Coordinates of C-alpha atoms in Angstrom, one line a residue:
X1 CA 113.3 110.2 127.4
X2 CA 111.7 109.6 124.2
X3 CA 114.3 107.5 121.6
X4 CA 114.4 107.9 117.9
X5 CA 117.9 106.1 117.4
X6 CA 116.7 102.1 115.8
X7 CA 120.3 101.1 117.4
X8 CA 119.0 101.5 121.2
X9 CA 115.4 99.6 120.4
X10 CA 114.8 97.1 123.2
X11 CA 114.4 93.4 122.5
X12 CA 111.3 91.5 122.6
X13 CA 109.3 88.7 121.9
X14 CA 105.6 89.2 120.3
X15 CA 102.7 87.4 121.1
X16 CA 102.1 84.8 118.2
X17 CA 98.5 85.8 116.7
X18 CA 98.6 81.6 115.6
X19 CA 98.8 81.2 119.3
X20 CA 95.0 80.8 121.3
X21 CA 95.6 82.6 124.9
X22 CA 95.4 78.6 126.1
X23 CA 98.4 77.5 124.3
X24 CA 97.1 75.5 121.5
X25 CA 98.5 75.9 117.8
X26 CA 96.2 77.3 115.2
X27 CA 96.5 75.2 112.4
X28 CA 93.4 76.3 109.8
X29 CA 91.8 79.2 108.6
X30 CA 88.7 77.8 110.1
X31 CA 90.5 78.1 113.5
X32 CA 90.9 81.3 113.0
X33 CA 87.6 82.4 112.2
X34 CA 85.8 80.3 114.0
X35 CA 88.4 80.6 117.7
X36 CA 91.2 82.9 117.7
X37 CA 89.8 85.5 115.4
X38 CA 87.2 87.0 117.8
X39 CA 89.2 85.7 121.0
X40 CA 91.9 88.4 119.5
X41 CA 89.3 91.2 119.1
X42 CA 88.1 90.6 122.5
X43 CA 91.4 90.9 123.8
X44 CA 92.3 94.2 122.0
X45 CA 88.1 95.4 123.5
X46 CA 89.0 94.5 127.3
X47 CA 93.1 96.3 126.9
X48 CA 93.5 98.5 124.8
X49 CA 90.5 100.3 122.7
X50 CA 87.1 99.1 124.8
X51 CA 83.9 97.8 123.7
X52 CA 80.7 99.1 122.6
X53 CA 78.1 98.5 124.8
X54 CA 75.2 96.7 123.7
X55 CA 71.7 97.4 122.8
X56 CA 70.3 99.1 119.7
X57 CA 71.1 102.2 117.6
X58 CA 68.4 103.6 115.7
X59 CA 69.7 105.5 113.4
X60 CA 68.0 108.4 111.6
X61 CA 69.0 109.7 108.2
X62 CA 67.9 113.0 106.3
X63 CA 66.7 112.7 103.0
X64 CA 70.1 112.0 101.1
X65 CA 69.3 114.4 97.8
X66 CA 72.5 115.0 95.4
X67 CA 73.2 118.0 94.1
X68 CA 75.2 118.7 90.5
X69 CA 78.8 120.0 92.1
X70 CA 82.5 120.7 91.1
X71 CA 80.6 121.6 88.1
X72 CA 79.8 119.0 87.8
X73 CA 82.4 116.0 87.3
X74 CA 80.3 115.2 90.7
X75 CA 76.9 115.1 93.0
X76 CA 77.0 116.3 96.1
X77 CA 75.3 114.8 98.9
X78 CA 74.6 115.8 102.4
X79 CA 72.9 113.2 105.1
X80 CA 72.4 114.0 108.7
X81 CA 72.8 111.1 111.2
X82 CA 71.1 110.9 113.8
X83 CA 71.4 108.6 117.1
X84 CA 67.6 108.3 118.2
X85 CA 64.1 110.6 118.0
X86 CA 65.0 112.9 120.7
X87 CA 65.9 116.5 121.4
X88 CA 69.4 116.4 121.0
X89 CA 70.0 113.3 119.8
X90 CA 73.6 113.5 119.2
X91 CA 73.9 113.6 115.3
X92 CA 76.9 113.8 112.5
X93 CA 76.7 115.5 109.4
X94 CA 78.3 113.0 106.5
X95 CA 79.2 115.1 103.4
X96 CA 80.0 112.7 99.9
X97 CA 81.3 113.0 96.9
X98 CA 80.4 111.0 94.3
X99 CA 81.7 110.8 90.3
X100 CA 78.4 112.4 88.1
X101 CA 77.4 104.3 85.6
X102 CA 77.4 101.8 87.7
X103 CA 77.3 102.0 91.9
X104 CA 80.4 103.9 93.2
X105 CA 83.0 102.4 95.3
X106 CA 84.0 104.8 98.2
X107 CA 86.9 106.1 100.6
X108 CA 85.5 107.3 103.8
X109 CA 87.3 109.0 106.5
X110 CA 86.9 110.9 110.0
X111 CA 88.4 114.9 109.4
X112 CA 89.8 117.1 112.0
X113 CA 88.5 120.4 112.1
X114 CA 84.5 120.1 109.8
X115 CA 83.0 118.8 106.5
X116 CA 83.6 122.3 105.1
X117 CA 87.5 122.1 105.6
X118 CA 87.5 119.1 103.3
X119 CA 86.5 121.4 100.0
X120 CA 85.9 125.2 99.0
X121 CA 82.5 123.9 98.4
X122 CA 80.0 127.3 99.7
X123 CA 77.3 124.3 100.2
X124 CA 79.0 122.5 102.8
X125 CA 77.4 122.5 106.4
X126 CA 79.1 123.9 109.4
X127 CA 79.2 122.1 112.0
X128 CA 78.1 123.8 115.4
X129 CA 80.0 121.1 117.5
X130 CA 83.0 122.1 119.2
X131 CA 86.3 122.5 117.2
X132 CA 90.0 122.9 118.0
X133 CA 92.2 126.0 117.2
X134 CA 95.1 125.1 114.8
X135 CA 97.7 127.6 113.9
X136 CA 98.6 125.7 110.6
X137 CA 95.1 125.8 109.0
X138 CA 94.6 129.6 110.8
X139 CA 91.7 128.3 113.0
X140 CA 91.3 130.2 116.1
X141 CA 88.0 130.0 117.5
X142 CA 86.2 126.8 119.1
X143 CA 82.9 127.5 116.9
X144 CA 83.5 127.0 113.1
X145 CA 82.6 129.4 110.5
X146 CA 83.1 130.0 107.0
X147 CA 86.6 131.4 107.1
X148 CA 88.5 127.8 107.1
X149 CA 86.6 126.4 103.8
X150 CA 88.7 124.6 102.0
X151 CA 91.8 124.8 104.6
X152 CA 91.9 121.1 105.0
X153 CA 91.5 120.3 101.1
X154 CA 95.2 118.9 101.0
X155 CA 94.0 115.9 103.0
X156 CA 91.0 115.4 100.8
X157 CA 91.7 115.1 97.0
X158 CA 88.6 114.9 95.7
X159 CA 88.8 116.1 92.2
X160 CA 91.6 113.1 92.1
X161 CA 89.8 110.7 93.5
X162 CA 86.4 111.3 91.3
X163 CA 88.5 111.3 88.3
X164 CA 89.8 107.7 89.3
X165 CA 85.9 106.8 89.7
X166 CA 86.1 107.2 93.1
X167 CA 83.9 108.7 95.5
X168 CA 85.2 110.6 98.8
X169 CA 83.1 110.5 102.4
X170 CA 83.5 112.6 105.7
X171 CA 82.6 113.1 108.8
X172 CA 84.2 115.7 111.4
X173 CA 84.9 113.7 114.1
X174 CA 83.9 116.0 116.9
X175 CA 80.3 115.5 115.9
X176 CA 81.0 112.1 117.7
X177 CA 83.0 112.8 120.6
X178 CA 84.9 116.2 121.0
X179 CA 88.5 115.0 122.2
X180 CA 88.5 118.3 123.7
X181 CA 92.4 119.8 124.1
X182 CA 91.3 120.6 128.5
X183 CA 90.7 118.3 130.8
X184 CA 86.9 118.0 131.8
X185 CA 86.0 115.1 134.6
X186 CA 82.6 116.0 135.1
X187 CA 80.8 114.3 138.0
X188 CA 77.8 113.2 136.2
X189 CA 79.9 111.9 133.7
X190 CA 81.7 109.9 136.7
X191 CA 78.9 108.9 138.3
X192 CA 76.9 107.5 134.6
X193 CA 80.1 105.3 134.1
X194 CA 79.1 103.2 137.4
X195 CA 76.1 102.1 136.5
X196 CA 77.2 100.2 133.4
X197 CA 76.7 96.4 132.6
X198 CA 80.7 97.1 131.2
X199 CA 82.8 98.0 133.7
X200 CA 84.6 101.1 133.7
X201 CA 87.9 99.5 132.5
X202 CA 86.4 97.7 129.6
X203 CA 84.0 100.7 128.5
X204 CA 84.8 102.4 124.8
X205 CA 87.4 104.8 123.5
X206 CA 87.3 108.0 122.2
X207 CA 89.0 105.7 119.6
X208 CA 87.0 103.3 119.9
X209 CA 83.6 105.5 119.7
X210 CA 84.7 107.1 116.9
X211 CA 85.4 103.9 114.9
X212 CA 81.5 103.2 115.9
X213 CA 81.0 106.1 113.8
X214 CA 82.9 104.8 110.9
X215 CA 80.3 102.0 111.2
X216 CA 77.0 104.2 111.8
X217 CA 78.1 105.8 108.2
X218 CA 78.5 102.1 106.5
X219 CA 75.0 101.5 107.5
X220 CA 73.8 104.9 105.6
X221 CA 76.0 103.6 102.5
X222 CA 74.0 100.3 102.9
X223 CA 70.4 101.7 102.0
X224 CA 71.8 104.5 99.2
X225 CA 71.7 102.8 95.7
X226 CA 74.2 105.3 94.5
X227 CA 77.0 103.4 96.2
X228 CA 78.6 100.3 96.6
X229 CA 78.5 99.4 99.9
X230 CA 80.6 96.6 99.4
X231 CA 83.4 98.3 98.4
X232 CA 84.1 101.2 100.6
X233 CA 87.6 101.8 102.2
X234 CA 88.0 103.2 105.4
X235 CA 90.8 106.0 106.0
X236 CA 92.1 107.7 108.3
X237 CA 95.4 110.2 109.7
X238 CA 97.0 110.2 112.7
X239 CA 94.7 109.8 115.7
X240 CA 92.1 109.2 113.1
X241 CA 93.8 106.3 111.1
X242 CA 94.3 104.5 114.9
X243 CA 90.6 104.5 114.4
X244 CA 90.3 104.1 111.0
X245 CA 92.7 100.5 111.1
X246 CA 90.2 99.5 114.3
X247 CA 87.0 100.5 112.4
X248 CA 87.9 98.5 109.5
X249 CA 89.7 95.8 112.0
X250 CA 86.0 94.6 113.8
X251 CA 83.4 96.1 110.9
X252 CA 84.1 93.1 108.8
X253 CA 82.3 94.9 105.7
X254 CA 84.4 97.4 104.8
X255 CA 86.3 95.8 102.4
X256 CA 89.8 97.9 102.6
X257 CA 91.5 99.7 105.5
X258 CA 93.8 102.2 105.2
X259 CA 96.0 104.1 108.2
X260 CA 97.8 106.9 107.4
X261 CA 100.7 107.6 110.1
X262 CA 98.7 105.8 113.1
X263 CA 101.8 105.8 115.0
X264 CA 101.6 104.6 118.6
X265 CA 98.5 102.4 119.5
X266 CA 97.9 102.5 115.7
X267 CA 99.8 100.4 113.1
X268 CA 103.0 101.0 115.1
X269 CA 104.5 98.2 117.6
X270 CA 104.2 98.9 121.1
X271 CA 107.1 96.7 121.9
X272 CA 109.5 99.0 120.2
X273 CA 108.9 101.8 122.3
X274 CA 110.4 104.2 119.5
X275 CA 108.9 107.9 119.8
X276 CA 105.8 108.1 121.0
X277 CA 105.4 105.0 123.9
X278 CA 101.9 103.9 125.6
X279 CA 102.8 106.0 128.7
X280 CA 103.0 109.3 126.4
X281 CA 100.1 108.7 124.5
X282 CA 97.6 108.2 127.9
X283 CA 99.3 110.9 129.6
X284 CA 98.6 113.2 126.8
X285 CA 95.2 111.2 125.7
X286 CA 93.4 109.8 128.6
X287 CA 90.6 109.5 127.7
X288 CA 91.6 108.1 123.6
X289 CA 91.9 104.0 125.4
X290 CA 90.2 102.3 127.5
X291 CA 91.4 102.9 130.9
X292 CA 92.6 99.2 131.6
X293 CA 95.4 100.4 128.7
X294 CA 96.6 102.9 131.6
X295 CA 97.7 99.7 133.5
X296 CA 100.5 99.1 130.6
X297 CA 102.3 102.4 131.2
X298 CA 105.9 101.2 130.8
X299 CA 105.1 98.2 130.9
X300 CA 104.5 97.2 126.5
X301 CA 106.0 93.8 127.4
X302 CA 103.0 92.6 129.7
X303 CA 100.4 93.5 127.1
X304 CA 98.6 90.7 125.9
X305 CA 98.2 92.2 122.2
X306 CA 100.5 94.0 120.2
X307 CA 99.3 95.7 116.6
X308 CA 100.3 92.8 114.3
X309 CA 97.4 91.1 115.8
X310 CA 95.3 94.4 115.1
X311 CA 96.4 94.5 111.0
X312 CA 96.1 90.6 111.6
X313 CA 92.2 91.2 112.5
X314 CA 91.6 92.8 108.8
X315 CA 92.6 89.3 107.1
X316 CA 91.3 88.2 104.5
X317 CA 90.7 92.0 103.6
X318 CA 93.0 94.6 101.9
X319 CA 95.0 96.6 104.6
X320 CA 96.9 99.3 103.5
X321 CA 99.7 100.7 106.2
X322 CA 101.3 104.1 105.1
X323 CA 104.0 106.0 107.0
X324 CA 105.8 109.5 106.5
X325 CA 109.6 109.8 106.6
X326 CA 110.2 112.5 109.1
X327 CA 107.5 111.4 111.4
X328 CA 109.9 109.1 113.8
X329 CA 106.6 109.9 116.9
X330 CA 104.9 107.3 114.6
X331 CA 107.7 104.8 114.6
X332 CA 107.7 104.4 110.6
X333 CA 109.9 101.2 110.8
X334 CA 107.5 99.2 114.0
X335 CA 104.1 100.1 111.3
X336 CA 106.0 98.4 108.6
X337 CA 106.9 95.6 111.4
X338 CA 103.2 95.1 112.8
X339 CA 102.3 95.0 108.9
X340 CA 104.9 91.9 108.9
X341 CA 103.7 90.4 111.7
X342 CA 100.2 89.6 110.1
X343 CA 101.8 88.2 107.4
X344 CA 101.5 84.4 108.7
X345 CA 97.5 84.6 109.1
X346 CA 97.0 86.8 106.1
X347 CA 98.8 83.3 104.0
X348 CA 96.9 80.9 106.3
X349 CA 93.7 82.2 104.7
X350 CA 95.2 82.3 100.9
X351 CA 96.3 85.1 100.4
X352 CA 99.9 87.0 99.3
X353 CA 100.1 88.6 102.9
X354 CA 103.1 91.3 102.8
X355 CA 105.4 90.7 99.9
X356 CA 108.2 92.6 101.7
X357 CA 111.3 91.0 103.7
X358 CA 113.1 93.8 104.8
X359 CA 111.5 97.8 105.2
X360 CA 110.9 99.4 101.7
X361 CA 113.0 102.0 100.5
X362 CA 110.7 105.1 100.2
X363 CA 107.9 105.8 97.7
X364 CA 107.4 102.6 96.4
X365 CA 104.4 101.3 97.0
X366 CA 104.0 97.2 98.5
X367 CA 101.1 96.1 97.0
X368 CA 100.0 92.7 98.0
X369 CA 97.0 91.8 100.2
X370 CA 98.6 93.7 103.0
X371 CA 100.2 97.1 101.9
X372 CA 103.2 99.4 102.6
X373 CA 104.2 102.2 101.4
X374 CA 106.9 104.7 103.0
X375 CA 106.2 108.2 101.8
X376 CA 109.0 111.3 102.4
X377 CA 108.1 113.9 103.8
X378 CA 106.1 115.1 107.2
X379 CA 103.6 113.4 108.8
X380 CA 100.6 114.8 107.0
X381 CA 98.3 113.2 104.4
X382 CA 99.1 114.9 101.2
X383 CA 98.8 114.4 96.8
X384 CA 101.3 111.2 96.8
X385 CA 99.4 109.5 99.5
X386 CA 95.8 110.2 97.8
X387 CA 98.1 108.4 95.0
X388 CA 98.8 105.6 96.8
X389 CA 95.8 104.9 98.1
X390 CA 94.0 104.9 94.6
X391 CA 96.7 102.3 93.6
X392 CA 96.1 99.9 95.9
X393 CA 92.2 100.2 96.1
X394 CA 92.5 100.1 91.5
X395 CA 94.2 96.9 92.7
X396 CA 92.3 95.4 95.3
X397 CA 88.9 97.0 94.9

């Protein structure tokens, strides 16, 4: 059974991220970016969150308008994204926030259940794509509607962040890839998967696809004036912050990274198998990982990655790691552990890496280059956390 007691963790050794798979020391930062660096993210691609496949995305973007909103303290805009010219073209609606001087830095994030959750906001789009039920936020139809405006806002403190001279971007992450609560193996779907240049092992990721999304949203940022594209920080909860810490792991231009409660096959260390263990989470999740991850069921200690060499893949860049209390599924103490296991290649490219020895008494936050902070309470994202994440982007960003 599942273990929530620190006293019965197991032992075990980590792979050293200043290690190359062939044995030799890395010794430079220019080893590291020029060798280990990507020999790491490949890794990580072929066990554990899959790669995209190649060949070109031609992205399509609605006019982009901006609209006097939260009257008005902000503009409003609206930007549909599409992949390709064709009838239907998947697409993803990207709703933004942006303070009503000089171009805006950003937090971006994936939500759970539509743009319109985010905010009361009457102008928000629903989305048609598929959406979960959710007894908490009283949603209980598949097809959104206007009745769950603003159930979400909690998650999403705008009217904080634009005050702080921040803007706030979202996408509902079902317009990318439904993670349907039902099993569905299709046989089209089965038989599409052969015919791949990546074989079926290796292939992306719900996680992984979703991240991809993350990045299709920096490319819009990158041709609207009104932002800074160059200082955007990627967020994410829960499922969402596993993709939000991989997004801004391999997009190297997002220039912070923030995971709130990631949890297993997130921030947390697999090793530890405390709560929620890589069996549980493809059981539950099959198709979240690539399927090669299946093959580590029980088996953490064969892995040839462990998430310090994820948080690792963010250096030189901010990383912000934030756990909940109460949530002992996410393994608070192994996030705080992965975050220290990065330390040594954060300081081998200059800079403070995680000024933290032992785990931080709650609701403090660790500020350095790589971040911490231990918040009480339920996994959620809530007021403090908004809080925190404004105090290390004001210091970093």
């Amino acid at each position: 059974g599942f273990n929530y007691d620190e006293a019965q963790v197991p032992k075990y050794t980590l792979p050293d991220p200043l290690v190359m798979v062939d044995g030799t020391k890395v010794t430079s930062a220019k080893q590291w970016n020029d060798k280990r660096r990507d020999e790491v993210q490949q890794l990580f691609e072929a066990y554990m969150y899959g790669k995209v496949p190649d060949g070109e995305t031609e992205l399509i973007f609605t006019d982009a308008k901006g609209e006097r909103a939260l009257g008005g303290a902000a503009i409003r805009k609206q930007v549909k994204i599409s992949f390709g010219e064709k009838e239907d073209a998947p697409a993803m609606d990207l709703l933004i926030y942006l303070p009503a001087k000089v171009r805006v830095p950003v937090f971006l994030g994936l939500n759970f259940h539509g743009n319109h959750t985010i905010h009361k906001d009457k102008e928000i789009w629903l989305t048609e794509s598929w959406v979960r039920t959710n007894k908490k936020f009283g949603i209980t139809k598949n097809k959104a509607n206007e009745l769950s405006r603003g159930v979400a806002a909690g998650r999403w403190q705008i009217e904080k962040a634009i005050a702080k001279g921040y803007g706030v971007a979202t996408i509902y992450c079902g317009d990318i890839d439904p993670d349907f609560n039902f099993p569905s193996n299709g046989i089209q779907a089965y038989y599409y998967k052969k015919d791949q240049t990546i074989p079926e092992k290796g292939q992306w990721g719900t996680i992984a696809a979703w991240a991809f999304g993350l990045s299709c949203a920096m490319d819009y940022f990158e041709t609207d004036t009104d932002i800074d594209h160059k200082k955007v920080a990627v967020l994410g909860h829960s499922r969402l912050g596993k993709t939000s810490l991989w997004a801004g792991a391999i997009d190297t231009r997002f220039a912070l990274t923030i995971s709130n409660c990631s949890g297993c096959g997130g921030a947390a260390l697999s090793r530890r198998r405390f709560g929620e263990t890589v069996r549980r989470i493809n059981t539950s999740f099959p198709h979240w990982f690539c399927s090669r991850f299946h093959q580590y069921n029980d088996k953490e200690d064969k892995l040839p990655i462990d998430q310090h060499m994820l948080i690792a893949l963010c250096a030189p860049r901010p990383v912000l790691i934030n756990s909940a209390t109460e949530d002992k599924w996410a393994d608070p103490h192994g996030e705080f552990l992965a975050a220290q296991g990065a330390d040594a290649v954060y300081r081998m490219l200059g800079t403070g890496g995680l000024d933290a020895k032992k785990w931080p008494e709650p609701n403090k936050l660790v500020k350095s280059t790589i971040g911490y902070h231990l918040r009480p309470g339920k996994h959620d994202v809530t007021a403090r956390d908004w809080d925190v994440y404004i105090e290390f982007a004001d210091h970093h960003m």
